[model samples]
Target chain A: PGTEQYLLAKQLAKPKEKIPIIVGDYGPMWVYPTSTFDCVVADPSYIEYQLTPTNTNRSVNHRYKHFDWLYERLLVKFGSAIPIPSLPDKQVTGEFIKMRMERLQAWMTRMCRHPVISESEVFQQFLNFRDEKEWKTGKRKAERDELAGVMIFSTMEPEAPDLDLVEIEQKCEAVGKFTKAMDDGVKELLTVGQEHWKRCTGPLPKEYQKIGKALQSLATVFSSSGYQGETDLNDAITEAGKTYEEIASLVAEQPKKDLHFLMECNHEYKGFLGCFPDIIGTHKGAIEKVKESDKLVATSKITLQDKQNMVKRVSIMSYALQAEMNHFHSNRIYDYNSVIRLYLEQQVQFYETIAEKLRQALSRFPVM
Target chain B: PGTEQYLLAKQLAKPKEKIPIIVGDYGPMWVYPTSTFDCVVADPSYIEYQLTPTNTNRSVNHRYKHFDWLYERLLVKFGSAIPIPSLPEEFIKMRMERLQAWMTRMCRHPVISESEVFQQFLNFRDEKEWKTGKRKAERDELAGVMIFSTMEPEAPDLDLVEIEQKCEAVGKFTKAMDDGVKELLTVGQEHWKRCTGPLPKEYQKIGKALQSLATVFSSSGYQGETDLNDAITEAGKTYEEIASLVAEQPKKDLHFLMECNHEYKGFLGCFPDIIGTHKGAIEKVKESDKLVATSKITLQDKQNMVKRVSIMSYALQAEMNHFHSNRIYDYNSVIRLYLEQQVQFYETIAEKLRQALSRFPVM
Candidate 1:
């Protein structure tokens, strides 16, 4: 006696959200919610009957009819969203859905509050107008710089002051530099990574100056601090340049026995070298730093705490980098190196502007 | 054609040793090693067959022949080494082994030689006179030990080492210790172990111990080191200690819990404790220190290397402790308390001896 009472009093109650509805007295009977369980199980016997073989044509025809009725019952009850009469043989039955498509289209179009064009699909028309230009067509000649321009503006809005953003930019620069170095080292590894180390120690040529230039560019950029968005753009440029230069260095270092000549190419025509985590991590860290800094300033003028915040944020970013770097590294190289190649050109213009701004700022703050 | 020529030449001219045998000659049999695969697949068939009325007897008699054939083959190969067949329905064995009665009798006997006797199934009745003890008691008391009895030719040809002469005196000490005369039982565990053996002649406390002590004394006197003889004794003691102390520590560890400060060392030793990496590491460090100190005099004067070795040793010991401490914390208190009990007793004896001997370096 106590068991049922204990369960009813202490145990959890079942979730019930009842839907009240009206049923019509018509040709097709609408199933009451209470009887839905019985209706769900009723189809298994019909399925078994359909599977069972009958010798006579009359018996087989009746079985098929039984299946058709079952199908119709399901269609009426479930509101068939999918096309069922795709098979050539199934179309002969005519009982399968065809008229339902017109009904579905009519319902969607009505609900969407946009008139469905009778002659053409609306999505196709919309895609041709805007999506094609944005995604498919290479209408913009300097697409990488153009995209960079947009990202730079969007990221720096609201006077965002965040160290993680700057750090992420440096990390991005690092990824680019390391990847390029790896490419350069691979060539040396091929040649100097030979059977004889003594032969490899012979004087390397001056053409390696180009890689040196790229490395210097990377080292110089990381050596200073700058805003998140601008730094991010700089990072993207440094990465692209360093990677190309490294590839060039590798080719030169590892001379082919058969070719007897060096590679004389500068162009990296690979499309869209993209690392999502680097860019996304930059954005997330920047956003988090902004939120945290603002919250801190609102609460107190504890600048020392900001240093702790910096450490915590960096650690968080480092953990994220550890998780995402491998995937991003692989995917970025495989990606079409379009946006990255354009960023390299934008980098030169941006650096010049930045240096001029630094000079102006120095002039204004003379020995404060 | 060149590839084919290379391949042919490589195959014909390459005279190499056959690949060394890597594993035992047990074939990769098709049926599973532990259980039959075909038997597993026919589960539904067997269950359904049992359920049906027509197939009752055939299904019920499935495993009788399997057990019979396995036991039959094992008996032929291993002979008496195969453990005596103790079937569930003991009286119903269709094939009874010969000399079952004799085997059972020998098994009942406590002596190690008697078990060997059971395996051999020799003429136990031929030596019935000795077995029944009709003759005078045989003595193995003074067989092994070198007495070094220097005789003055005018007197008897023996002047005994008094301590070695008193070797066959176990029963008095055993009785004293068992009956709570612990103070009088001054003999250490090492001395008592030498005496205890299963042979009837050796079972006499005085005789067996005298024989063992005689062996030790003689070997020490003649060889000076007694390395071979000590090795045999060391092996016997090792198994004895494993059973009595190490294995039994967890089973009887209350003394450690009641007295030992768990806050200090009890955390390291717990119930069902395995003396593993931690003990190995401690010993390793201690050994390394000894070696390095010796090397200072014997080889190069490299005392500077001691600091480096110390650090490395400490780090390894720390790692071992980390693992052991973590395991100790994870084990249930009741189970772990058992091991902790013995840990205290061992360390207490060690501490007391440390004070008592004061100068002896057993450590």
Candidate 2:
């Protein structure tokens, strides 16, 4: 089994070269099915299990139950086959896409990032198990699993892959099957993917609509470059997501579903372009807007900066949408250069302010 | 005016005694309101105007108006506030608070704390007019105005006083206000807070109830050490708000809130008596049955580890309630220490676990 996985990874790494790649199916115990691989390496040993049999199987069982719990949990909270069909076809449905997106986003970014013991535990566990070698080798199995548990429990980490392309495709497929299980589920996730901005509730058409628009625009931009692939579709979708998230981040107004839609898009979109810097930058902007408004809002007529943030967020989202649609060349420099580059610059600017402030901090008089 | 402002600040460096803090009214024009301070320090400079007087009121009135116009233009997309205030306070209120907390946290801890453009703009205004050496020998003139805005607007530069005391106070006060006003005003803010929770539908109790329950625990913990002054009382209401934000810190969830409440009471109940560590450890075990469940329930039932967490949370809440109500002080170091110190240690351990696998984080 391990050999087969390695061969598969080898093949995937260099398609024309018929060498074995490295990949392995996790035991059935993984709460949800998962696989890991390297170009040409194998570690079949579940060391902890081998070392501590009693604890090993118990841990495995804990994981198995986790997935079962997730399925039911999603069903109850998000009406079965969340995002409806649970399809990985790169197609999202329903108006609640926006709301779903918002909820998921909350879970992913805010809820998931919480310093709660739960989050810290996962972090600490990862640290406890953080193999410097594994991290260097990109073999963060323990850390990934631990973090995934936190993300999953929070429902922030989607059942789909976090940073893997193939897994995304597979998850999208699973979603398709999942959605097919129920009518309402299918309707909620898939239906609104086609609709424009009419319902203002269900899955947002903006994401898809923006992607569609971006694709149309890409035809012109890339006509000169001749870049086309299914990946383009996703790229456009993901880049557009940056734009969408940007807008959502700025203009989001309890736009749970809208934000959720964009964030989910961000999670998936990242697989294509490492979650473009603009999206991340825009995310930072949205977060800052939230903080600044927190206190000053009371003094201003608008004590809250929520709605405006959504608009700003969505504008960035629109820009991201544009990027995703236009991102035909896998190595598009603009994604990194124009978008993320600015984000980095902004980050530095923020850092300097902090440094200066700290220097002055000691000057503060004693409270006593 | 600028020269005098500078001279005054120079003189105040080693004042022999604390001057009476007099807050003055804004004259017809608000400029002097700030400049009146012979030794001026404006946390927020009310400098709508400039010495150039190219713009009257020398104030940012024109700019403020311009900014206001931009703001108004932006608001057009989201319809005007619900005139009737039909939205339930619960639903809108929670969303509002989350938005506020998140945004404030972001600012206090901005991703990038410096930008020369920002820095230049802030300093330019301060350095432009003031002489840094005026009015040295005079009694106080202007009560409010200052030549310079003391600090640049940086998220990390949180005024602990504002976030801890002032903000907390306001939170309490707001909670005590009429429901409708709070709701609408809070709703209006939702446009800006970048809420990470569900959107505002018509009116749902889930968000509010959850938020409220969580806040009850949070306030209980926070109130232990902090003074529950008029502002804290006014802005926060256990039944109303999760206010009393710490500057630059994210708002606490219900679980954390509860834990804090529990710890403080436990501390108060025992610490003064100086109980021994081992006895205190055993005290927690004895008080096992005394746990109070904050928010009625938590969605953490994955493993024994999680259950332990839930139980610990329950204990802190209950113990705190017991201590607060009883106000009895006896330092059984073991019980007291267990209740006061041990709980947090264990709770921290549990929190790490929960942070890894759970949603709805308890701090």
Candidate 3:
């Protein structure tokens, strides 16, 4: 009953916790390309969609290339966390174009499954583009650059109110621990990217080169006898090897680029987690001390003047605490949870876009 | 036990199976580029080596790219039966030059290439570039037509026992690759399951706090520690499965490949004899055609009929080689298509030859 109430008050005052809902429950219900035929001559093939619950039909006429562009932009903003599935490889043989249309439907369905992505302002803009003229002349290049700038610089918020507290030792220990943890975390992330990089670059090119070499030998045997043409074999081998070399170089650079991105992200996260014990933890300690001092005054163990002085200190401490809490609430909850999370989601997409480019490069190699 | 003895007797008559002695137990013991101070001004960086056991040192002045040429020839001649390792990407970066040196050592091992082309590539002393035209494509008579001969021999009677043994080897190889594919899929899916999060959420203050705690517990949520750990554990089990599969089938595939290689060599090794018997049969067919032609036809007409019958034999043999060359790299599909066409080719040729020979009395 003595100190129990004080501990209970502190515990009860803290916020109840659950997993972060980065995106609320909202997504597109239907999205697909609708084609029409006319008896006279011309017909339009356009993408049609309706948002969930609203069920209002909306349509957009855009080329296949336009969808590719939108896919790229999304990937550039959101990285591997989105797990965007691959598109069908472009082809001329067989029912390739028809298959591509089906894959587009599948891709849209997967995109709609992610609430954060589906509700994205950019995503909605892409979906609701009925005005073809505006889309073509929307100054999209400038807008994309501006959006990228916003995402990159949006991590920092205005400073918290300074509070006087006596817990320097514990704060320093916590900061040290957080920094070490962050450094180790960054290393692990880099390792993941590097490991994949090695997997992509190691055996593929060598196997390809082996096939090319074997062909070259066959050409040597056959060319004079005219079993197969020398020039065709030579040209294919040369072209395939050249393409593989270019792709290998591109894949090899990915791990280094991932490392750079991690380093950039680490600076911000380290600053955020490192300041925890000093600002949030120290303030909580000060509140407990203020309460203990109030109890002393009530027991009349301290003089009235001493009590008055204590009151002044408590008031200043409370003011600082309130200001800090308000700043923390706005910055951490409102700013970080909504805006910064959006920014991070886009940041991840940026790397994923790079990864997609690597995938594209790899698929270019004509290996059977 | 009764059939077993018969099988053993047939097996004893067959050629012994061993790894193809491609490079015959002799190689360049040591190879290095020697740079001398006086020669440096006019020095061409030349490769030098010693033949092991013989201890005979040999020097050859050739550019590094020439070695790549030699490597290609070896692969084409052997096909996929030999699991040839790859060369290093470059000569300088990553001590790739060292890998090339190691490749030379491996290539020198007796099991790589048995052709005269390989021996000439290593021992050729000229400082000049290896000309493509001068590349004497050594006629591996055993190479081109031998694989086809195994599937469809030109002989009148087929050896049922030999075909049975070959079919069993092929069955075992197909099982190994199929099992490997399924095992890989199991491991790949485990990797995905551990890495992905399916948890759904809405943005709320309480949710954020708990998520933050969850992140900390999940190793800062940035690193996929749990995912990677789970994948590795799964991979370990999958590897044990893989090891057993490999242990059972690796040697079996190798043995089968060696058998195929041996069949090819044996057919080519007996080529001169085949030509001898084929020449005798054709000459007798020609004499019979002449004997029948004199009774009713002109000399030109007799010559035309003889040539037509000869054309059938050559065309059929050519088709057999065509199908055989294609089926060498492919497995079951090769056997399927190769045997089907081979039987058909020989059947048509036999009937046509029978018709031509029936018109004449026995020579």
Candidate 4:
């Protein structure tokens, strides 16, 4: 399993033709009374897939619960040293369900891109299961497998004896500071996006709405008194009063169309951030163990071969961390670049839409 | 008193060929013991000048306090019957623009516009003339509510009951209009403050937020292949530009209308008192009618008393026509201009945003 992970890591580091696994429209489970299990994903909720080289089925139906199971499986396989990203863990309501669905799509993309976790027997079980027996057998084996968790570290071969330990220790320290900086930045960005979303949905609409109401009142006075420019002025004011409210509703919609995608990316990156310290902590622990073993070997408390074994363990963390950080950087660019494009595109469209609305409102006044 | 007002009222009925009042650059007193005002229209054919509107140009200076005195005199002479635009006692450019509208309203009113007192304030070219006219204006008997008694009736054989009913009807209308105007004034003021002050500051908060997020990106040297930091920094700048648009919008679009609202509020505010003065004159007619029945007063006393009531009706009707036409013209122009400005405002911001967005790579 350790050799296969190393082989996959090298495979992922280079450019290659690939098909990403797709998760779409996650929703309710439909049970069959006569059936052996919650058979497949229901109605509109289906995966469209480009499977990895060893897998067979390209598409399958799956439920939200099935995805949750897959999530648990990936965590068990990779959670010891890798910072596995989170899913929608809070309440799932109507709109939130749609949000959750997209989040799963993004999560699927991340997992498929990961070198080791993507090929885990458990992940393949999630994708290629055509019936209950194949899926159930895979689940039991994944849980009972000796190589599934921290125990997998045993299978990793130690690096050559000539390697310098101190050089690797310093690299981890630098990456540790860089990771902490990135983590804090992601959290700060998430907070700003969330606040901006609240303002778009709440105060912005009310502010314009109050302005509309005031103009409506002024128009009523003009109409009642039959002020001489009543048709051109009053009609324009009345039209603007209604148009302002329409524009306000558009302003209210910005969070859903523009900010939401960027926010979703920020949230997922933060989930990845949440897992960073522990991953780095284990590397620190590996270093401490090496120090302990060196003392013990000199004191005759342990054999020199024992110190050699500890060096091998430390080497696996170095290997995992390097590949993981590289994978993270590639995803970072993909995440920010695409979503911000969508966000700004939506912003431009929203302003252009309201500006045209005001133009239409001005036309109602006739050329002054 | 009666002869002076009738002569002035009839002369003003068809406007006179005269020098148009123009007030400009009011500053400090300078202790020369002198001088005056901005903005107005005029008398080529009298009616030919419905307004040469944007048609007047001149330069003069009066101390701010001196203009205050001119305002004080006008208020004493006309405040009971006419709505004078409130003085700012504040910002100069803003004060000048508003003084323009105020002076405009005064010159358009048939009664106050024609007064010897008004012209003295308007065309005071010399210190001696200014002092001379100022004293004569103070001595004039036909000012404020008292001016109604001196007005010449344009209608013949005025029926007492018809006159009383018309007076009360106008009185009711003015009261109804006052409340409406007050509401409009306050609403506009609230709108102006928000657009120029809090609303712009709110956008600034969002702008700074975007910029801070940009700097946070900068802190990491976010090492972008796609100019992500540049895009966010540009977005922050666009928001700052938008804040200026919001802050400046009122001065562009709404201030002119707000100025009109202020004028109408002041004029309408004065009417209830003016109408009450008319009612007291009517009450005097009844008092003399009872005295005439007992022969405690002569028939001449009752005749002259009824004539004063007739003059009150004539004066109100004349002022009403002047008031109605000017309001129609002023509100019509300002409101239409405001809507057009709003169109520009939205379009301008949209164009700015589009340009800002173009600074980013096409995605």
Candidate whose DockQ is highest = 4
Candidate closer to the true structure by DockQ (higher is better), 3 or 4: 4
For model 1 chain A, give the 10-residue run with minimal summed lDDT. A262-271
True contacts recovered per prediction: 0.00, 0.00, 0.00, 0.22
lDDT of 4: 0.61
Candidate 4 regions off by >4 Å? A1-69, A90-96, A112-115, A130-136, A148-167, A226-229, A291-293, A301-304, A366-368, B1-61, B89-93, B123-131, B156-226, B279-311
DockQ of each: 0.00, 0.01, 0.02, 0.22
Candidate 2 residue-wise lDDT, B292-340, digit = tens:
2433222221122222222222222222233222221211111222222
In angstroms, give how far residue A185 of model 2 lies from its true place. Answer: 5.9
Candidate 4, residues A1-368, lDDT tens digits: the string is 33323312222132122212111122111111231111222234343323222234256656666677777766776676667888765363435545555566667766765655665567767777777898788878877764545544444332333234786687578667767776676676677667767767886687677667666776666565432445766677788878888988988987888788877777888889788787777667667667777788889976777666566656655655554565566566666667766776777777778878877876776444
Clashing residue pairs in all predictions, respectively, total: 16, 159, 12, 7
Error (Å) of candidate 3 at residue B239 is 25
Output the better candidate (1/3) by TM-score: 3
What lDDT score is found at residue B110 in candidate 1? 23
Error of 2 at A51 (Å): 38
lDDT for every model? Answer: 0.27, 0.26, 0.36, 0.61
Which regions of candidate 3 deviate over 4 angstroms?
A: A1-226, A256-259, A298-301, A304-368, B1-363
For residues A1-368, write the lDDT of model 3, one tens digit per residue.
31222222222222121101211122111121243111110122443322221223444545556667666666554321122344445685335544456455645654654433465555666665557666654427424643221121121111323323343333334433543554454344334434444544564344333433433333233233222223543344334334434544554454344433433333333334444444434334544655566577789765566644443433333333232223222222222233223323333444344334434433433322
Tens-digit lDDT string for candidate 4 (B50-139): 122232344334544656776777777666545565666345555665565666666655555656776656566679887898788777
Model 2: chain B TM-score vs. truth? 0.14
lDDT: which candidate is best? Answer: 4
